[PDB]
Design a protein around this ligand. Structure first.
Ligand SMILES: NC(=O)c1ccc[n+]([C@@H]2O[C@H](COP(=O)([O-])OP(=O)(O)OC[C@H]3O[C@@H](n4cnc5c(N)ncnc54)[C@H](O)[C@@H]3O)[C@@H](O)[C@H]2O)c1
Ligand SMILES: [Zn+2]
Ligand SMILES: [Zn+2]
Lengths: 405, 428
């Protein structure tokens, strides 16, 4: 049986004008919107010199940390890129068919550079696009108080391998990258988290979760810590626990409030609200039942603190990213993003092709002709007839009764 | 050096579809199977059973002769064979990252796919089997197939035979929106569809969009297209024949020729009318308007300029009749599927369907549409020694104290007798 030991309490046109204006008047309109919305009166596209001077203050220790975190994304993305293979294959004898795998040409990456945003928000798209083999990555981020892009966001963009960096925000950023203003290189896709105008802009042109699965072997102090971890994001950050153990369920429900109370003010408020409004706890009969619930919820970030982790890897089917075991944790960072998803696959295209010998068309031609004529597709059948006549001049095959209607 | 020797004399959109679907879905959500059954009666005049039994399937396909079956069987196998190969091209793996960190990709099929087949008068039998065959090749466990009943007897017997031979698990005599919704909600089966595919009218399209969003519109829809890239070595009689091939579909089927050979362009432009004129009445009428209004011939200077304009047009079906086929394969970047060389042709059938390029590049009907990649990670204790520090220091810079403490807790548990610079805690 399933028991809800805790349940959740609670549960756009401006874009049309701006885009119509930007489309009509181009870079001119982007500059005005920059000054009107962001007070930005300076250059949009940063030079190599501007980038190094604006990030000169960033210390060596901070750079090393960010460099390390990027490498953990990049190094997975590199492996993942190779998981989609090109191939040839022979179907019917003399029929060859295959798949090419191309990166897209241009990716645009937006980062908000606001407060209580992960620096990961700035480097994930850029680092992923580059590992996928995209040759042009354009990164935008809104300027901080007419001083430029937040140095940490700017350092991240650069270290992640962005090719062009533009101090530009909101709808102007997305439109610019999509229409290819300032670079003359339209983005095949734009990615990155932002506000509601940003999201609707990306819609017209083209809340942080955490779940923990746990059994009796789990350490509730860590579980509770992990739930609290993402709870501090905002007031609408779900935090779910799915367990087969009442003891853990109760013990966690007892520690979470205490850990929240020990947080600093802003994080205390956020987590207090979030745990109350969207926090959930679910006790279940079997493992097999937990799966069912987990898969229905499909958390963006799913931790699994149980015995027999292989079983859970094998049997779970719906989630953004899986954190397997206690040691890793959501805060260490997902390598990808689930469906908002963001991975190398988002920036990769397959193209399929086929080729035939004449010998192959002997059978394929006559089947096609007969089928086409049963379909009433006389012109179709005739593309088969013509090849038969050219390749097999004195052949008489059953090519089907010609259409008269 | 680009020159339009023949221009399109028309352009390719009202959403009255939106009204009907919103109403119909609203209704079907309320009353379920009874609303579906009632819509079948009002729209199609249908009163029979919905879910076919194995008996009914054999019964209704009994008058499909052995020779016709063998041809369909053959055509389905070609799709299956490509699909199985294409499935093998997306691999599972694990990789070591920072020492003690393991990460990886799981690849698995979706549970349930719904396939719709318009099964009208001028549809290809391939439309019935391509969805179903691809879904099964992908390892989808439940495939549900729907087609509106033909003439009071049931599903068109060729369509029904195709569904069965392609490996559909459940077959249902439903048309239009009510078929799409039934498959989406899992009416009659208790198995809601993860995706629904299959061509149809603007209502079927709108119903898919409404229910699935992007994954519901990302497959090539609209009239059948054909493009041919041809150089001086191409045979104009074959080229003209291939263009006319798809132009008979209807009045809005575009047929494009991109060529570096003025000579070929002129010969094709003269041959097409002659070929159309020799078609039977229905086809003649279809192709005449199709070519007149939507036929294009583009003469280019170099190979690069043909690539430029081909990628812009991005035909669902692109033939390449040139020398040096390896080069064209290497340099073309946007198309539904490629027919390399003169020997193969569009009517032999692509083994996938390309993206909805007229919305853009992503999507289409292949095994890839029916498969998910899930990523995972796992760490030893030792791995966290470095990762926890970094996370802690980064989190505190972000003002994320709770985040940092998830690392503090692990550092304290795994490494009691050790101290690390975990950043200065947040006070705000
Ligand atoms: N170029 C090609 O390759 C090709 C070939 C054949 C058909 N088509 C296109 O496919 C479509 C086939 O048309 P179809 O009618 O057979 O579609 P369909 O077979 O996809 O759907 C038919 C069903 O639609 C429903 N329906 C019809 N009119 C409706 C209405 N006004 N309101 C609500 N439901 C309604 C009915 O239930 C009917 O059974 C057309 O758009 C045609 O142009 C293209
Ligand atoms: Zn977070
Ligand atoms: Zn066709």
């Amino acid at each position: 049986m399933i028991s809800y030991l805790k349940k959740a309490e609670k549960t756009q046109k401006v874009v049309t004008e701006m885009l119509a204006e930007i489309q009509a008047r181009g870079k001119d309109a982007v500059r005005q919107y920059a000054k009107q919305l962001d007070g930005w009166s300076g250059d949009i596209v940063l030079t190599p010199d501007q980038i190094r001077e604006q990030t000169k203050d960033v210390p060596a220790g901070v750079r090393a940390d960010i460099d390390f975190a990027i490498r953990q994304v990049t190094d997975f993305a590199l492996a993942q890129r190779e998981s989609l293979k090109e191939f040839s294959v022979e179907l019917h004898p003399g029929v060859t068919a295959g798949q090419r795998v191309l990166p897209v040409n241009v990716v645009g990456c937006y980062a908000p550079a606001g407060r209580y945003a992960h620096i990961a928000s700035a480097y994930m798209g850029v680092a992923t696009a580059k590992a996928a083999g995209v040759k042009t990555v354009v990164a935008c981020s809104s300027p901080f108080r007419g001083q430029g892009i937040h140095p940490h966001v700017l350092y991240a963009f650069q270290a992640a391998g962005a090719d062009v960096i533009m101090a530009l925000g909101g709808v102007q950023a997305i439109a610019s990258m999509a229409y290819g203003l300032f670079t003359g290189k339209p983005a095949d896709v734009v990615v990155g988290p932002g506000n509601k105008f940003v999201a609707e802009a990306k819609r017209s042109l083209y809340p942080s979760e955490v779940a923990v699965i746990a059994d009796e072997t789990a350490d509730p102090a860590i579980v509770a810590s992990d739930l609290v971890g993402q709870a501090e994001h905002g007031h609408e950050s779900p935090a779910w626990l799915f367990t087969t153990s009442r003891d853990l369920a109760d013990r966690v429900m007892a520690l979470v409030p205490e850990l929240i109370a020990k947080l600093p003010p802003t994080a205390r408020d956020a987590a207090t609200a979030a745990w109350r409004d969207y926090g959930e706890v679910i006790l279940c009969g079997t493992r097999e039942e937990v799966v069912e619930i987990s898969d229905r919820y499909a958390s963006e970030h799913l931790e699994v603190h149980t015995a027999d982790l292989d079983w859970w890897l094998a049997n779970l089917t719906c989630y953004g990213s899986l954190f397997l075991g206690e040691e890793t944790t959501v805060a260490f960072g997902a390598k990808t993003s689930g469906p908002n998803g963001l991975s190398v696959h988002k920036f990769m295209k397959t193209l399929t092709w086929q080729q035939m010998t004449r010998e192959a068309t002997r059978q394929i031609g006559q089947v096609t002709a007969r089928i086409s004529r049963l379909e009433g597709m006389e012109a179709h059948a005739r593309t088969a007839d013509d090849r038969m006549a050219k390749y097999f001049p004195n052949a008489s095959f059953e090519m089907g009764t010609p259409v008269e209607v």
